[PDB]
Amino acid sequence: NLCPFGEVFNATRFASVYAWNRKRISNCVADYSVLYNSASFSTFKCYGVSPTKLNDLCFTNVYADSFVIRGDEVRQIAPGQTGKIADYNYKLPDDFTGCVIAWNSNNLDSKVGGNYNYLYRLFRKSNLKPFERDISTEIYQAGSTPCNGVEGFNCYFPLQSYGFQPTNGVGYQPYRVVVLSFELLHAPATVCGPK
Amino acid sequence: STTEDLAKTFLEKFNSEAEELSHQSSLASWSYNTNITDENVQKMNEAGARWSAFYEEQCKLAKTYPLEEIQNLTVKRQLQALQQSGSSVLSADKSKRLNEILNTMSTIYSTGKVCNPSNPQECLLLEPGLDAIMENSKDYNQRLWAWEGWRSEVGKQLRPLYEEYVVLKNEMARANNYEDYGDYWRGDYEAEGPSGYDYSRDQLIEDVERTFAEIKPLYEHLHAYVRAKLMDTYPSHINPTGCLPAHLLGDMWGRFWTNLYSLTVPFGQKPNIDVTDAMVDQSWDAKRIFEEAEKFFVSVGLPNMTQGFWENSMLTEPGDGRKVVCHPTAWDLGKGDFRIKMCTKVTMDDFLTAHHEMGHIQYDMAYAVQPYLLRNGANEGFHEAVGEIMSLSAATPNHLKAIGLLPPDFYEDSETEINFLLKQALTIVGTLPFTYMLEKWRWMVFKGEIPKEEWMKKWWEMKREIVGVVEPVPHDETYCDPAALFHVANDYSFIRYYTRTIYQFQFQEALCQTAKHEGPLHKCDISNSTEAGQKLLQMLSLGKSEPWTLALERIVGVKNMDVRPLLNYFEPLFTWLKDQNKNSFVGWSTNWSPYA
Ligand SMILES: *[C@@H]1O[C@H](CO)[C@@H](O)[C@H](O)[C@H]1NC(C)=O
Ligand SMILES: *[C@@H]1O[C@H](CO)[C@@H](O)[C@H](O)[C@H]1NC(C)=O
Ligand SMILES: *[C@@H]1O[C@H](CO)[C@@H](O)[C@H](O)[C@H]1NC(C)=O
Ligand SMILES: *[C@@H]1O[C@H](CO)[C@@H](O)[C@H](O)[C@H]1NC(C)=O
Ligand SMILES: *[C@@H]1O[C@H](CO)[C@@H](O)[C@H](O)[C@H]1NC(C)=O
């Protein structure tokens, strides 16, 4: 009855950021040691949660949101941040309590000639609400002229593809990300540490 | 809602699609240049075609957003850079002819060959062969056959094409709201800017002419000195108060006097400083050379190189079986991909090249914080000036000592310093007249101030008066000699080489004042100055984001060209030259000619 973190971090396939994947970690015993021990992680920042005290504690739910973005965007996955990713792909609330973990994926998610399978939303009429998800393909009407679904002048398909070639720089390189949200109120605590 | 908002959105979409298509062109261009195969020729051609087709479409689309309603200057700059299309305004029948002329002129230059009256079967091409003569020969007549033959077999063929080229190009500019093709070229120095940082295309001429005024006394004395020394080599054909014959200047045109060094060397017994032997004796390699270069930028506060650079660059001729281009090229492939292709040898020159090309990479790396379209130098003169200040510091005897290639006890002698500043003058100061005069002629042909009936009369009048240079053989209007130089047959502006030069030495003088240099500027190394690399990086950061006036002011404190820097580098030689030319005439007569 362990909590399945290796199903999130050690997953073979990751998601695009506009279609970020969410997994519920509920009613289970948590091995946080795997997370903190591993030195593969190039980003491990927690807001609201003390990484050590988690073993002592219990939370009703732990959500594991996974996606792929590029290295110079990893900074956007944090409270108060602005940007394409924060505004149009994946938003964290300003009162966010949890941890953000990222690592370099160039060995897996990059390809000679490029891997254009991971995408992101370039335009959107409004900024995403905290933990919102937009999988719509509707043509972005920037001007007053209706687009009629074809796409054209001032009328753009709203999703663009990252291109990941192994020779890119670190800020243009693929980064697999995991956001762990810890919820300690308004439901019966079910995810406990080993303590 | 507003047009500016639509433009920002337009630009954001462009940037995402352009960055990847540009990058893909760079990648295919790199695989051809490091693996010369027919397969990679196709893919380089095909990838640059898709990108070129994309860039044109976007330029037309960009014109749809009117610049008048764009309040953001950074958005404005990007739209401007995109909106300029070129020959697109011309009718398609015209446009095909213009490219027919252009491709013909370029092929004539590349496939042109001249034959010696003696041995009517030994015909030679420019590269190699004629170019060898014009750089290494000390025979008056041998060099004359080459100079006249080039301007005869190739220049005469190019004459009618060039006259058509002027008319079509002039219309293209007139249609694009420019007075002439020359005004069109001079827009690369235009800047709308905010307050005090605007620059008019006409103002470029003013500033080129006032500054060249100030270079003239230095050029005269270098010219008088070379004439005297050449009088010993060519006594029958040199007049001590006259211009110099154009076929005796050290290359096919006299664009650099660098190869007159053997014959003009002030102190021939004193040898030049060449750390080549040290590097070989200390078992240096390409890797060490580039590591020292990275250390030089690290010493001033700049970025280390990227792991990609080290992993992905060609810093040595491949061997394997791969044919490669070995011309030293710094790249920026896009997207944090920063590479150099040098077939690096363990020589002082390639040591010095590495420092220049990594000053490219380092400019590349600082302006990559900028929108794709605002990621170049502030003008066409800034980029090679940044590389140049890096060869200047690294060849100083003090750097070469500190890094262990010159013994700690090295004799800096006044004679070896003068012999240096001469070789520099023959390259750097030599070209400054050649450059200005080419471009004045073109600017003035394009304005129509030079009739076609007088083209090559004013050409050679102007070489006489300005460059101090005279026609070996007389030449009529059956000739286009302007256009027996690459850049003129292959439709490239030339004043970049003049503008580079004045910037170069303005940048060095200011970085060397922040490193608090005591003494002659020709001996300045900026190594270990964190303050200098701040000022440098405050410019390099900007790219083409702000006016070029403001980019200069951030290094140098001044919004325009000043030649006072250049002159102070060379003031050592000026003094020597004047005393060595005191029992000589300084200047030229426009009248003498080798033939009459
Ligand atoms: C992934 O696998 C490695 C090695 O098999 C293991 O050390 C690590 O704990 C795993 N990660 C997770 C999240 O369980
Ligand atoms: C050279 O190009 C050929 C195709 O022309 C390719 O198969 C080969 O792998 C390339 N070699 C290298 C090392 O780039
Ligand atoms: C111009 O637009 C850019 C968009 O990134 C914005 O950051 C900037 O503040 C705007 N203002 C000016 C005048 O630079
Ligand atoms: C890059 O610069 C940093 C910061 O000084 C330095 O610690 C690091 O060792 C340098 N990288 C190299 C040369 O490995
Ligand atoms: C920079 O300082 C270090 C330590 O003082 C010295 O070894 C090195 O030679 C200096 N570099 C230069 C060229 O000033």
Which DSSP string do the residues of B370-392 spell out, in sequence order? S-GGG-S-SSTTHHHHHHHHHHH
Q: What angle do CA A184, A185, A187 make, to 5 degrees?
A: 105
Phi, psi of A80 (to 5 degrees): 75, 5
Contact B306 A169 (CB under 8 A): yes
Q: Is A161 helix (H, G, I), strand (E, B) or coil?
A: strand
**Is B394:B289 a contact under the CB 8 Å cutoff?**
no
Q: Is A168 on the interface with B (CB under 8 A)?
A: yes
Query: For chain B, what is the radius of gyration of the CA atoms?
Result: 25
Q: How far apart are CA B330 and CA B364, in angstroms?
A: 9
- Select from A167, A170, A172 the residue whose CB has the most chain B CBs within 10 Å, as the one to mutate to test that interface: A167
Q: Which two tokens stand for residue B382?
A: 């800034």
Report the pocket of ligand 1 as residue ranges, CB < 6 Å.
A 5-6, 9-10, 34
Cβ within 8 Å of residue B46, ≥6 positions away: B28
Question: Which of B426, B474, B107 shows the shortest CA–CA distance to B264?
Answer: B426
Element (H, E) at B149: helix B140-149
CB A170 within 8 A of CB B336: yes
Tokens of A91: 């938003």
Q: Which two tokens stand for residue A191?
A: 């995810």
B370, two tokens: 């900028």
Could you count the other beta carbons within 10 Å of the beta carbon of residue B475? 20
The CA distance from A156 to A176, in Å, is 27
Alpha-carbon gap, residue B264 to B588, rounded angstroms: 18
Q: Least CB-CB distance to B13: which of A156, A168, A172?
A: A156
Domain ranges of chain A: 1-113+166-195, 114-165
Resolution for this PDB entry, in angstroms: 2.9
Residue A185 carries which DSSP code? S
What ranges in chain A are assigned the alpha helix state H?
33-37, 84-88, 106-109
Q: Check if the beta carbon of residue B105 is closer than 8 Å to that of residue B161.
A: yes
Per the DSSP assignment, residues forming a β-bridge with B340 are B330
CA distance B87 to B237: 47
Q: Chain B residue with minimal CA distance to A172?
A: B335
Burial B351-369 (b: 16+ CB within 10 A, else e): bbbbbbbbbbbbbbbbbbe
Q: HSE (CB half, 13 Å, CA atoms) of A79?
A: 12
At B2, list the tokens.
């507003």
Element at B147 (helix H, strand E)? helix B140-149
H-state helical runs in B515-595: 530-540, 548-555, 564-569, 571-579
Q: CB within 6 Å of ligand 5 — which residues? A: B 299, 399, 402, 525, 527-528
| B385 backbone dihedrals φ, ψ, rounded to 5° | -70, -35
> Which residues of B are less than 8 Å from A168 in CB distance?
308, 335-337
- Of B2, B175, B13, B174, the C-alpha closest to B78 is B13
Helix (H) or strand (E) holding B277: helix B276-281
Quote the CA–CA distance of B7 and B224 in Å, as a whole number: 58
Quick one: tokens of A131?
């933990």
Question: How was this one solved?
Answer: X-ray
Strands A21-25 and A61-70: antiparallel
Residue A21, both tokens: 């994947």
Residues with Cβ within 8 Å of A53's Cβ and at least 6 positions away in sequence, in order, are none
Q: Which of B3, B8, B11, B13 to mutate to test the interface with A (most CBs of A within 10 A)?
A: B13
Residue B329, C-beta contacts closer than 8 angstroms, at least 6 positions apart: B33, B340, B341, B342, B357
The count of CB pairs under 8 A between chains A and B is 51
Residue A133, SS3 per DSSP: coil
Which residues are CB-contacts of A6 (< 8 A; sequence separation ≥ 6)? A34
Q: Are strands B244-245 and B469-470 parallel, antiparallel or unpaired?
A: parallel
Q: How far is CA B572 from CA A27, B284, B512, in A?
A: 84, 34, 17
Question: Where in the sequence numbering do the catalytic residues of B fall?
Answer: 357, 487
Q: Do B337 and A167 touch (CB under 8 A)?
A: yes
Nearest atom within ligand 2 for CA of residue B34: 14
Is the Cβ–Cβ distance between A115 and A109 less than 8 Å? Answer: yes
